[PDB]
Design a protein around this ligand. Structure first.
Ligand SMILES: *[C@@H]1O[C@H](CO)[C@@H](O[C@@H]2O[C@H](CO)[C@@H](O[C@@H]3O[C@H](CO)[C@@H](O)[C@H](O[C@H]4O[C@H](CO)[C@@H](O)[C@H](O)[C@@H]4O)[C@@H]3O)[C@H](O)[C@H]2NC(C)=O)[C@H](O)[C@H]1NC(C)=O
Ligand SMILES: *[C@@H]1O[C@H](CO)[C@@H](O[C@@H]2O[C@H](CO)[C@@H](O)[C@H](O)[C@H]2NC(C)=O)[C@H](O)[C@H]1NC(C)=O
Ligand SMILES: *[C@@H]1O[C@H](CO)[C@@H](O)[C@H](O)[C@H]1NC(C)=O
Ligand SMILES: *[C@@H]1O[C@H](CO)[C@@H](O)[C@H](O)[C@H]1NC(C)=O
Ligand SMILES: *[C@@H]1O[C@H](CO)[C@@H](O)[C@H](O)[C@H]1NC(C)=O
Ligand SMILES: *[C@@H]1O[C@H](CO)[C@@H](O)[C@H](O)[C@H]1NC(C)=O
Ligand SMILES: *[C@@H]1O[C@H](CO)[C@@H](O)[C@H](O)[C@H]1NC(C)=O
Ligand SMILES: O=c1cc(CO)occ1O
Ligand SMILES: O=c1cc(CO)occ1O
Ligand SMILES: [Cu+2]
Ligand SMILES: [Cu+2]
Lengths: 331, 334
């Protein structure tokens, strides 16, 4: 009974399929889904999905969160993201599938949906921010499970930035001009509090060969999370050779993952093993044993963990710097 | 009887080949080719192949023409630039990203270039058998772990590859397109009405039809009779809802072979007397012409890349049974 249609109201092992109801709400043309919520994760983090059509206007007015670190991962389609810390140069990228944008506390930001089939996976730390979407949004029954329908919010940690003007000199999906976006490697900001972007496949990667091949592409480490105390990355996986036992994991902090590509089998606690496909999400409470392996010859998941030393950091630590998005051809 | 094979069969029969299966893999430099459907596996109806490769600062192939093959470029993930020219018409170029499509009819000069590290192009060539070229050009790859990719004019002409040495890929690309008076991810893309002309369809920006006969299905045509002419096939994506209360998953049969590769979601396919099988991203199913099959989506929304030999296979059938639709999403109510 691992599978649920809305995130549970208390911490427990669960899997929720892509486009499940997930307390769906709409905000104009956008449809939000809350795969993992405050209640659901013990307030460790929120993992939500936003589906939306092209829009000629910003999806939200510029604003800041003082207590929440926000992460934007493009599942598909595309959306532009703007960000600025203090008086540092304003940054903007157009994110396509697999691209990532990091938005720390106190960073002014906004976004705009570009493509007709756009999906933004949002990871917010800590959890509970979603209350704002319940409040400002309109409930959506969404019977068919269709992806989307064809200055007063300080209480909700939303602080307006009405002076902020989103730059309009974007060329080749980025601005300012002296940036690298899909044309060279990207690094995680070394300065805490600064926003940064990693184009799909262009960031640092680490190969782990302890249990078949796994490639971790870090998005947020301790360096960036500081006191928010979490890590975020993608983990690409080979199959597990028959001569390797699939390891059993346990971590103090809750963790979760959304499959982006492939077929991943997860077994959590005393629940039956379940195979996840695109956009499917698995949530594992802290201190609960879990095993996972890829049935597909190559899978890739978006992974979030509460704590400084969860699964992704563990695989990196037991691994090595790696230059490719593909793993070795030989075991 | 399991549909699953590791390489395409040397004859026609129902099968399913998993993403990144060996598929008779070969490499040409950094590029890894997989032949999910071949001439012999499809009765020469068409070829469906996967090309995985890293970024390159150089073209991935010298500009050339095919006089007897219609080429189709679909970006499964990552991105790559495609240039195409018909005769003396303006040279067109687009940077395809996930879900984008490039159509390259016969006698159209073309080349491509890999941009992102994890780029995958799904190629559909009609008719089938064109893969012989890659058997010659490529080196057999064992790829034990199934990693996506590894980290002469007389002979080419005989493979229907006619070099165009004077072709100069244009260098004025901006926002992933050139020339300037073009529409790429900023508006509607129509299928070309003139045969032999190349065209490009950005993910979700092309024409769509909503079929409500068996739940909701949205067909986004990539190639129709208009464009295929004598090559006699269709190509498109089909997006699907789950099958709702009172509705039974229907059974289909069409004279020409057909196939699909899942892009998103989870799709169950049952072909002939074989056991049903659930497919995930990149997985391919092949259905011989004249064999009965059923498919449905276990996922709340799935999207597949579909090809059919003949002018009236599944996709055209759904279009004919449906109505023009303006969204990539289906209605919220049954
Ligand atoms: C490549 O793509 C980028 C987007 O990724 C695109 O950038 C866009 O440029 C247009 C045109 O410059 C911008 O729209 C303008 O923004 C400015 C700055 O605020 C406004 O002053 C403009 O308003 C005037 O012009 C309007 C339309 O002509 C009038 O209707 C209006 O009343 C004003 O007179 C105008 O809206 C847009 O802001 C950017 N977008 C981003 C996100 O940067 C660029 O054009 C593309 N490059 C090429 C060469 O194709
Ligand atoms: C936007 O990106 C394009 C490439 O997609 C750049 O175009 C290249 O520009 C240089 C200089 O003109 C040429 O030598 C290359 O041949 C071009 N490549 C292509 C594929 O056309 C373009 O310069 C970029 N624009 C800006 C302002 O950054
Ligand atoms: C963000 O700014 C507010 C007010 O300036 C401050 O109280 C808060 O501690 C800041 N947090 C961070 C992480 O900068
Ligand atoms: C970070 O989170 C982990 C997992 O929840 C927890 O064990 C640890 O106490 C936290 N560390 C800090 C500094 O709060
Ligand atoms: C392609 O061009 C060749 C060269 O002239 C010509 O013989 C042939 O008829 C053309 N084929 C098509 C399909 O237009
Ligand atoms: C590569 O494999 C193909 C098909 O299995 C075979 O026909 C060919 O002889 C092989 N190439 C070499 C040089 O071994
Ligand atoms: C087009 O293809 C279909 C299916 O393969 C076939 O039944 C039909 O006869 C073909 N038409 C021609 C002219 O070959
Ligand atoms: O700026 C934001 C945008 C979205 C949409 O994903 O969610 C939360 C935000 O704070
Ligand atoms: O031009 C071509 C490019 C590729 C790359 O996959 O395959 C076949 C071709 O004809
Ligand atoms: Cu925000
Ligand atoms: Cu070609």
């Amino acid at each position: 009974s691992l599978i649920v249609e809305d995130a549970p109201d208390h911490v427990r092992p669960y899997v929720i399929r892509h486009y499940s109801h997930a307390r769906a709400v709409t905000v104009d043309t956008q449809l939000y889904r809350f795969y993992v919520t405050g209640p659901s994760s013990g307030y460790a983090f929120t993992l939500m999905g936003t589906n939306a059509p092209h829009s000629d206007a910003l999806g939200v007015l510029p604003h800041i969160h003082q207590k929440h670190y926000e992460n934007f991962y493009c599942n598909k389609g595309s959306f532009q993201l703007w960000a600025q810390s203090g008086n540092e140069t304003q940054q903007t990228r157009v994110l396509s599938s697999g691209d990532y944008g990091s938005v720390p506390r106190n960073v002014t930001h906004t976004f705009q949906i570009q493509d007709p089939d756009t999906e933004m996976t949002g990871v917010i730390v800590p959890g509970g921010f979603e209350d704002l979407f319940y409040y400002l949004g309109t409930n959506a029954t969404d019977t068919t499970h269709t992806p989307y329908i064809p200055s007063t919010l300080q209480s909700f940690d939303v602080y307006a930035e009405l002076s902020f003007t989103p730059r309009t000199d974007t060329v080749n999906g980025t601005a300012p001009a002296n940036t690298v976006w899909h044309t060279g490697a990207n690094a995680l900001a070394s300065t805490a509090g600064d926003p940064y972007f990693i184009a799909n496949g262009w960031g640092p990667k680490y190969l782990n060969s302890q249990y078949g091949y796994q490639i971790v592409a870090p998005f947020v480490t301790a360096t960036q999370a500081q006191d928010t105390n979490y890590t975020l990355s993608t983990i690409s996986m080979s199959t597990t050779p028959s001569t390797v036992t699939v390891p059993t994991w346990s971590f103090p902090g809750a963790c979760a993952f959304q499959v982006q590509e492939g077929r991943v089998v997860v077994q959590i606690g005393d629940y039956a093993a379940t195979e996840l496909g695109s956009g499917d999400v698995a949530f594992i409470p802290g201190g609960v044993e879990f095993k996972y392996y890829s049935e597909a010859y190559f899978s890739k998941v978006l992974f979030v963990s509460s704590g400084s030393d969860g699964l992704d950091q563990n695989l990196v630590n037991g691994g090595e710097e790696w230059s490719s998005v593909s793993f070795p051809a030989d075991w």
